[PDB]
Design a protein around this ligand. Structure first.
Ligand code: AIC
Ligand code: AIC
Lengths: 137, 136
């Protein structure tokens, strides 16, 4: 009833841990950090503003500022207000899926594609419910 | 075909972080710490740990992990090869209070079975994730 909340963290931790390690070279190659990486990954979803990102990421605005501009100067992300991704930046996310998806399907090769559908419905509804709530002051 | 599920997992995660980060903002303020320092306490809510450990699981900059630790010593939410404290134990309680109270309200309409079935598919995936990781 609550070690679900504890499992979630752990589970999230573990994913983070594995992803960081998995994407170690792909980042060094583009000379980016793990967060420069995320923001990048966090931007494949929607166009944000340094404010939108600091909030969404819960950290110091100052930090979010450089990580951000360091991406402009490296031509990975671009402008309009409205921070979007540059094609170089895309090739990156492409090589991110490319890696993620390979090890991802290994651990999922024997899943009841239907049992998974049901699982996603629940998570999707929880996802929807999280976004919903997230808005309110 | 499977790429779809991944995109979701990431978003679902992103949203969890956003939410937790939004819900704890004031508490991390009320005590006077940054999320960074706050994540440290949570990895200690579960157990103990030295430097190389906390520096490895998160895995971030050797120094970074160090500098936040030393700050956590001053507020005394961490005892020294690093544990929690009376004040430390207290923060988490409060942290857990909010979280659960929301997740519950946000899930207290689901079918006991539906949920568990989720936990089990997530447990096996974590199990594999971990095993794969351990292969350095
Ligand atoms: C390539 C990535 C490492 S970037 C994205 C994010 N990485 C982070 O470091 C993120 N800022 C974070 C992690 C943990 C606590 C707080 C913040 C994550 O998860 N990521 C991988 C992805 O792209 O799938
Ligand atoms: C030392 C750095 C982390 S900050 C420096 C500058 N980037 C900035 O955003 C600028 N300093 C600044 C503006 C606002 C808030 C915080 C920082 C630059 O380039 N940088 C980094 C580096 O040398 O790696």
């Amino acid at each position: 009833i609550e070690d679900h909340i504890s499992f979630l963290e752990k589970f999230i931790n573990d994913v983070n841990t594995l992803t960081a390690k998995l994407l170690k070279d792909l980042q060094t190659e583009y000379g980016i950090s793990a967060e420069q990486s995320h923001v990048l990954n966090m931007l494949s979803i929607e166009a944000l503003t340094v404010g939108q990102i600091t909030e969404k990421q819960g950290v110091n605005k100052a930090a979010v500022s450089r990580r951000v501009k360091k991406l402009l100067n490296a031509e990975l992300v671009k402008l309009e207000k409205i921070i979007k991704l540059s094609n170089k930046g895309k090739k990156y996310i492409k090589e991110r899926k490319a890696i993620m998806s390979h090890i991802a399907s290994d651990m999922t090769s024997d899943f009841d594609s239907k049992e998974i559908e049901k699982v996603r419905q629940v998570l999707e509804i929880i996802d929807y419910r999280i976004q919903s709530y997230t808005s309110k002051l």
